[PDB]
Amino acid sequence: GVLPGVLMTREIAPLVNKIYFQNGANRGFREIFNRSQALNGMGEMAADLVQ
DNA sequence: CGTTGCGGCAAAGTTATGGGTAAAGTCACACGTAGTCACCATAATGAAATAAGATCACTACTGGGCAGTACCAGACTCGAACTGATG
CA of A41 to C1' of B6 (A): 180
Angle, vertex CA A36, rays to CA A15 and CA A44, nearest 5: 55
State which approach was used to obtain the coordinates.
cryo-EM
Tell me the C-alpha distance between A34 and A51, whole Å: 21
b/e map A13-50, b = 16+ CB within 10 Å? beebeeeebeebbeeebeebeeeeeeeeeeeebeeeee
Nucleotide nearest residue A3, measured CA to C1': B65
Tell me the C-alpha distance between A45 and A33, whole Å: 13
Number of other CB atoms surrounding residue A1 within 10 Å: 2
